Structure 1
Amino acid sequence: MKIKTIKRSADDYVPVKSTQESQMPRNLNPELHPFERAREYTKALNATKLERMFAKPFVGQLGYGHRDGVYAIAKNYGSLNKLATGSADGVIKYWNMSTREEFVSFKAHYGLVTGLCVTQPRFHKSQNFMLSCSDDKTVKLWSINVDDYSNKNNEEGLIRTFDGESAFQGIDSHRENSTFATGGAKIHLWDVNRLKPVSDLSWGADNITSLKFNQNETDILASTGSDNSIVLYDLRTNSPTQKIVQTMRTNAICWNPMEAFNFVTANEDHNAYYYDMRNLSRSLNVFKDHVSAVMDVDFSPTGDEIVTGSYDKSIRIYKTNHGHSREIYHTKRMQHVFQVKYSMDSKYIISGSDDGNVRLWRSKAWERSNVKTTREKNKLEYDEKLKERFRHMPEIKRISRHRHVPQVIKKAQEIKNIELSSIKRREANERRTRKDMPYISERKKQIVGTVHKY
């Protein structure tokens, strides 16, 4: 009669070769693969634990560091391995962080180094240039020999000095052109080939503490004042544009490299505020996981992540759309964070504290910098999404969210939470009787007023 029975060809399943890979039969019938959801959860729950034992953020420090506290850090936006660092001792250093050594070490100013920026001056490959400003009322342009290219073979040292009537407290350079701006008692626009300030910008008599040029719409500049104010400028008009007066002072700014109109501000109220340029009556987001004043803030070149340095001996790194830190970096030997900045490959975090040490941190503690096989990348890629799928699982939250935070910060937070609850009960009690209370949005409490209403 007609009969067929399941028949295995031995050669097909067992190769005749000792070296040929055995055929790897797969059938995607769901009945073959039961317990779909449970297995993914266990793989998720296993991935989360492994992330913790592999969370290894510290890689090393830059040489022997500075003598006095580090108070100025600048990255070369065109070269990976290069930083310009300065300390209040008056010494400025230019680093080869790939070898974790110094290219050159220079005693720039008698007083405190209050600003540092790296530039490509266009005077009217083998050398790099950096600009330093200090409270001794001078700005000095310096040149350093670099070993990126061997197409030639010197003149390493001071190139030009700009004398100022008043002390300088901030400096940044326009990306396209050689012009750079200094923040002193007055915000001044400078040209490399001119010793005197080319243009005088100033809304009023208040000083400027910090300033940062735009990267995308590079003609725009923002500055911070000691009167708890943020000022916007545009070079195409050569005039200020806007201010908003804040409740507290803002120490640092960083503008988003992926959104030209968006920026974050490091604030004195243990908060960092995300802003939209056009409508500044409110903030885009608020970051509130620090317990002391935020000293510096930097955007990743990816534009999706932000890192904040605070006075509470910790570095917090936040997702742009999430209002709470996903990670904490801390150490006993770290005394006060004043500068936090990103390796522009987005894989590492460069930090500077008053102990004089400049440190490298990993943006991803669990990731590793070696080149990985096609197989390897897939499984690591597997765990990330599987963790992403099961983020809010109760067990995964406990293992993932758990961090070893120092005793001092946790005590501040639990004290911090008590007052907020103590406040919150108070207006809630008041709300029972007094008829006319406007609810104050969390995004608008920290604005005091805006000059230009809209």
Structure 2
Amino acid sequence: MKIKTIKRSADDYVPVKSTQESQMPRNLNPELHPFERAREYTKALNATKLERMFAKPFVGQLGYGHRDGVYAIAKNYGSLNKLATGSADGVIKYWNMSTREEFVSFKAHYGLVTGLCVTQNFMLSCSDDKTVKLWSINEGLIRTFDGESAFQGIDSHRENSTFATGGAKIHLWDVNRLKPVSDLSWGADNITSLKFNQNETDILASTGSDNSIVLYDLRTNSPTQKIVQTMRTNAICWNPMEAFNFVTANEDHNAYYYDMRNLSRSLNVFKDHVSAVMDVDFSPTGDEIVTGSYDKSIRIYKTNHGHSREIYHTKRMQHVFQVKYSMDSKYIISGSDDGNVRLWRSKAWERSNVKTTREKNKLEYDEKLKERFRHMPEIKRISRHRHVPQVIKKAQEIKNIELSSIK
């Protein structure tokens, strides 16, 4: 008649020392755990409502900024701490991302600056008055590269320490050179922007003011393809991860992301914005594209989805002219027509704090839950949502009205 019971033993579950933490025996038997869908669902809804409560994108600006308006932002591609901002007045201002203050500033151009680009620190400031000036960061004006075109652009090149200019004609300069090496033109028109890709660095993407996209090959000193698009194009960005696809921004409120193998079909289209998208910048992950409009608004969205998971706007910035993404995928710098370059989060709930591994494992678990509870509709109403401005909400209404009349 064997008699045996349960004994908690009163020492295993309640520890000896007072300073000792509790023992936590777990049984993952599903009978003990009744709600694996619903309780995880409420945790996910708590996390989504909390990320709407943790929607604080703003950090601060850089210094007090330009008075006349930021038009181009250079980022040193090794320097995660430092950055440069060019004004249409001509004042170049250099900032450190820790201090958010003016590291060094210079009276570069009495005309506009159109682009700043960095290659050996060393900054290079391209003008409207046919001049590029070489500045060093701790003093000023090492050498000025005089070209025959009013400089509609510039772009840096890391290899051979090169930089080309964008203008009426693009002509490639060196550091030691005062005259350019070779000048290229697929078509006989002024070129709005240029961009070398970062890896297999020799390839270039050249927008064309008469609705054009050319792909320039430095290895041939000749363009290798050109698609004459519908409308003119503002700016460009090559992804640092994929290194053979690039997104460009168009005159219509649409950004098109193309492939170097196939320009005849785009990789993707993006049209959350309501005006001429100024600038695009791609994550070092390769995850999300951030793009700033002629409208007083920026937007972040991932590459595969195609719609704005994130939208950025506030009172005192307008017509932003420029958005430049991180080196560390964490913060976007945002230029202004209002002259003041603000520091903004990549995600307003993602925080700078290195996290205790209780809450860090919880936060990883919660966002893993957010994805497997994604397409439920009650999750969706909190997951899409944040305040949009009055005219732009009306402008999206206008766009839906006009596209409804089109179909």
Alpha-carbon displacement from aligned partner over 1:214-253 (angstroms, at most 9, x marks no partner): 1111011111111110111111112111111011111001
Cα offsets for 1:323-345 (capped at 9, x unmatched): 11101110111111110111111
Per mean C-alpha deviation after superposition, the further-off stretch among 327-336 and 9-18 is 9-18
The answer on 1:83 being equivalent to 2:75 is: no
Per-residue deviation, 1:380: 0.8
Q: Residue 319 in 1 paired to residue 302 in 2? A: yes
Question: In 1, distance between residues paired with 2:37 and 2:188?
Answer: 65
Q: What CA deviation, in whole Å up to 9, does each residue of 1:175-205 have, x standing for no partner?
A: 2221111011111011110100111111232
Deviations 1:36-91 (A, max 9, x none): 21111111111111110111100000001012111010111001111111101111
User: What TM-score do you get using the length of structure 1 for normalisation?
Assistant: 0.88
Q: Distance in 2 between matches of 1:204 and 1:290?
A: 30
Q: Secondary structure at the match of 2:335?
A: strand
Given that 1:59 and 1:360 are in contact with CA atoms closer than 8 Å, whether structure 2 keeps it comes out as yes
Deviations along 1:375-423, one digit per CA (max 9) or x if unpaired, are 110111111111111111111111121210010100011111011111x
Instruction: Give the distance between the partners of 1:22 and 1:221, measured in 2 at CA.
Output: 62
**Alpha-carbon distance in structure 2 between the residues aligned to 1:5 and 1:33:** 24
Distance 2:187 2:347 in 1: 44
Q: Matched residues in 2 for 1:75 and 1:138: separation?
A: 20
Output the CA distance in 1 between the equivalents of 2:183 and 2:35.
Answer: 71
Once the two structures are superposed, residues 143-193 of structure 1 have per-residue CA deviations (whole angstroms, 9 ceiling, x without a partner) of 12xxxxxxxxxx811101111112111111112221111011111011110
Deviations along 1:260-292, one digit per CA (max 9) or x if unpaired, are 211101111100111111111111110010011
User: 1:49, 1:399 within 8 Å by CA — same for their partners in 2?
Assistant: yes
Rg bigger for which structure?
A: 1
- C-alpha displacement of 1:22: 2.3
Residue 134 of structure 2 aligns with which residue?
141
SS in structure 1 of the partner of residue 383 of structure 2: helix
Work out the CA distance in 1 between the residues paired with 2:335 and 2:113: 14
Q: By how many angstroms is 1:366 displaced? A: 0.6
What is the distance in 1 between the residues matched to 2:358 and 2:401?
A: 50
Aligned partner of residue 86 in structure 1, secondary structure: strand
**What's 2:326 paired with?**
343
2:334–2:342: 8 Å Cα contact kept in structure 1? Answer: yes
For the residues of structure 2 that align with 1:207 and 1:108, how far apart are their CA atoms?
Answer: 23
Report the alpha carbon displacement of residue 97 of structure 1 after superposing the two structures with TM: 2.1
Other structure's SS at 2:315 match: coil
Q: Which residue of 2 aligns with 1:37?
A: 37
Runs of 4+ in 1 over 6 A off after TM superposition: none
Does the CA-based 8 Å contact 1:61-1:358 persist in structure 2? yes
Instruction: Judge conservation of contact 2:193–2:207 (CA < 8 Å) in 1.
Output: yes
Offset, 1:362? 0.1
Shift of 1:8: 2.2
Measure the CA separation in 1 of the matches of 2:387 and 2:230: 33
SS of 2:362's equivalent? helix
Q: Which range moves more in the overlay, 15-24 or 324-333?
A: 15-24
- How far apart, in 1, do the equivalents of 2:166 and 2:36 lie? 61
1:70, 1:88 within 8 Å by CA — same for their partners in 2?
A: yes
CA distance in 1, matches of 2:52, 2:17: 43
Structure 2 CA distance for aligned equivalents of residues 218 and 16 of structure 1: 65
Residue 415 of structure 1 is matched in structure 2 by 398
In structure 2, how many angstroms separate the alpha carbons of the residues matched to 1:418 and 1:8? 70
User: What does the per-residue CA deviation read over 1:310-335, in whole Å, with 9 as the maximum and x for residues that have no partner?
Assistant: 01111111110011110111011111
Superposition pairs of residues 299-310 of structure 1, within 5 angstroms: 299-310=282-293
CA contact (8 A) 1:15 1:22 kept: yes
Instruction: Measure the CA separation in 2 of the matches of 1:163 and 1:19.
Output: 74
> How far does the alpha carbon of each residue in 1:125-153 deviate from its partner, in whole angstroms, 9 at most, with x for none?
xx910001111011111112xxxxxxxxx
* 2:6 aligned partner: 6
Cα drift, residue 364 of structure 1: 0.7
Counterpart contact for 1:287–1:323, Cα < 8 Å: yes
In structure 2, list runs of 5 or more residues that go unmatched: none
Query: Is 1:215 the equivalent of 2:198?
Result: yes
Structure 1 residue 7 displacement after superposition: 1.6
> Distance between the aligned counterparts of 1:175 and 1:404, measured in 2?
41
- Is 1:250 the counterpart of 2:250 in the alignment? no
Structure 2 CA distance for aligned equivalents of residues 218 and 81 of structure 1: 23
The match for 1:435 is: none
Shift of 1:118: 1.3
Between 1:233-242 and 1:404-413, the stretch displaced more is 233-242
Alpha carbons 2:297, 2:318 under 8 Å: kept: no
SS in structure 2 of the partner of residue 209 of structure 1: coil
Give the Cα separation in 2 of the matches to 1:195 and 1:259: 34
> CA–CA distance in 1 between the matches of 2:149 and 2:189?
13
Q: C-alpha root-mean-square deviation of aligned residues, in Å?
A: 1.2
Residues 1:15 and 2:28 are matched in the alignment: no
**Structure 1: any 5+ residue segments left out of the alignment?**
120-126, 145-154, 423-454
Of 192-201 and 16-25, deviating more is 16-25
**Paired residue total:** 405
- Asked whether the 8 Å contact 2:72–2:85 carries over to 1, the reply is yes
Question: 1:84·1:118 contact (CA, 8 Å) conserved in 2?
Answer: no
Shift, 1:116, TM fit = 0.6
Distance (Å, rounded) in 2 between the aligned partners of 1:43 and 1:291: 35
Give the TM-score normalised by structure 2. 0.97
